[PDB]
Write a protein that binds this ligand. Structure first.
Ligand code: FAD
Length: 450
């Protein structure tokens, strides 16, 4: 059984390992050069939040130990707001609930080694150009433009949010594609080990600078450098045309004044802010949903290729790793590749839609809009119910971040919990008019333990 994978990123390299371990002949093609070839280059790859979902997918592949050896433990959040230095807000309810920060290039190199150790052949410096589904052949382009034609039996599209495989599929089947762009862009910035230490930025934490309609978030690296992401409107809306947006930050000097005003404890650590701002492009935020992820038994999409999402729950990589495991499982036990791909799509598509929406709801949190009094009372009640019934009432964030519950079931339980809270608080001022024992009974009736 032979398979061709396009894209030696996170999902593609993991599924290569799993399939090769299961006895598949795996050929993996990647447009970029092999990052394991030693150069003088200082890598500027971002650090990623690896949660229990991703960690478990790596465990199944036998790689968790190697990845975590090169990852920084984030025990909690540091929320930077004016008035006092931040204190750690620890994760969940014990020490075992942490998030790991792993550098993208480090993870990629570990996955590549893992894929080759399992028997996969990885071919770099070759970009997928086109696919011929009738004759079962695809075309790759090399660095100078030479076009190489190859046979495939099964094509896995793991080539990212602008997947060339997906583009090829659209020419033979209606993907039912819907694109939802968001008004925020992002810019990746860097903190050196020296800057971070000078201003005492805690390495073992996730750092956030909230500011209503815009914000920054930073994740640590092994060498004490941090990667910072600014999220900010591309343009100022028609109302509030003076509100901050990238269009006002016409150059690095404007960027610097923006940070000095809005993020004063962060600006001094951004040594290369001006250059980073001008040299790096402003990224776009979008969600892309497809009704179908496969063409018969010939081709399938996974990871960012199948379901681009906004980066606001730190789950795109975690979802991509989950995808790789599921795809390998379905391909190993299916009647033909066509059955495997349909079964895989039916399992993972509802979960992808769920995290895409929950990421957007996490993204919608980033707003200057105040919390309703109703909302605050619901939150207080939910914290009490979480204490009294910790196996039934679990905040949706913890279900997503610290468990392996399928995304769609996390969203379903969150819906039940929110309905329960909405009716318990409906026409009550404060908490003292709410019968907490009666509410706890409703929690027991409506939410089975996990
Ligand atoms: C700012 C930001 C922060 C994020 N933070 C997090 C986080 O904290 N946690 C998290 O879980 N996720 C995070 N994500 C999401 C995460 O980066 C992605 O979901 C993840 O990288 C997708 O993995 P993938 O393997 O599907 O795609 P990729 O990692 O993008 O891999 C695609 C690969 O295919 C290759 N390729 C592309 N086109 C071709 C072609 N034509 N031919 C051959 N090869 C090709 C590319 O070179 C690349 O190697 C973040 C995203 C952004 C933008």
């Amino acid at each position: 059984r032979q398979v061709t994978i396009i894209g030696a990123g996170l999902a593609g390299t993991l599924v290569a390992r799993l399939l090769a371990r299961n006895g598949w002949q795996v050929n993996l093609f990647e447009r970029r050069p092999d990052p394991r070839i030693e150069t003088g280059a200082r890598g500027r790859s971002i650090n990623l939040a690896l949660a229990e979902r991703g960690a478990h997918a790596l465990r199944l592949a036998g790689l968790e130990r190697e990845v975590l050896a090169e990852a920084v433990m984030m025990r909690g959040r540091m929320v930077h707001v004016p008035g006092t230095p931040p204190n750690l807000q620890p994760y969940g309810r014990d020490d075992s609930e942490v998030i790991w920060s792993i550098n993208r290039d480090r993870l990629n190199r570990i996955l590549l080694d893992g894929a080759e150790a399992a028997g996969a052949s990885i071919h770099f410096n070759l970009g997928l150009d086109s696919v011929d589904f009738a004759r079962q052949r695809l075309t790759l382009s090399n660095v100078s433009g030479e076009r190489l034609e190859k046979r495939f039996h099964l094509l896995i599209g793991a080539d990212g949010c602008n997947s060339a495989v997906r583009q090829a599929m659209a020419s033979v089947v209606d993907l039912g594609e819907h694109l939802e762009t968001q008004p925020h862009g992002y810019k990746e910035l860097q903190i050196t080990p020296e800057a971070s230490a000078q201003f005492n930025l805690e390495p073992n934490a996730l750092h956030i600078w909230p500011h209503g309609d815009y914000m920054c978030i930073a994740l640590p690296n092994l060498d004490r450098s941090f990667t910072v992401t600014l999220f900010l409107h591309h343009q100022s809306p028609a109302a509030q045309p003076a509100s901050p947006s990238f269009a006002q930050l016409v150059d690095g000097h404007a960027a610097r004044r923006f940070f000095q005003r809005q993020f004063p404890d962060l600006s001094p650590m951004l040594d290369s802010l001006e250059q980073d701002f001008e040299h790096h492009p402003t990224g776009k935020l979008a969600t892309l949903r497809l009704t179908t992820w496969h063409v018969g038994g010939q081709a399938v999409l996974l990871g960012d290729a199948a379901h681009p999402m906004v980066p606001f729950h730190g789950q795109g990589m975690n979802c991509a790793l989950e995808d790789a495991v599921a795809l390998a499982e379905h391909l190993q036990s299916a009647a033909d590749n066509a059955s495997a791909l349909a079964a895989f799509t039916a399992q993972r598509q509802p979960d992808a839609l769920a995290i895409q929406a929950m990421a957007l709801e996490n993204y919608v949190e980033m707003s200057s809009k105040v919390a309703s009094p109703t909302y605050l009372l619901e939150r207080e009640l939910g914290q009490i119910m979480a204490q009294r019934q910790p196996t039934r009432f679990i905040p949706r964030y913890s279900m997503v971040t610290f468990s392996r519950l399928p995304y769609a079931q996390a969203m379903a339980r969150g819906q039940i919990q929110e309905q329960l809270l909405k009716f318990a608080v409906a026409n009550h001022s404060d908490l003292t008019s709410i019968n907490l024992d009666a509410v706890e009974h409703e929690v027991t009736r409506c939410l089975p333990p996990l």
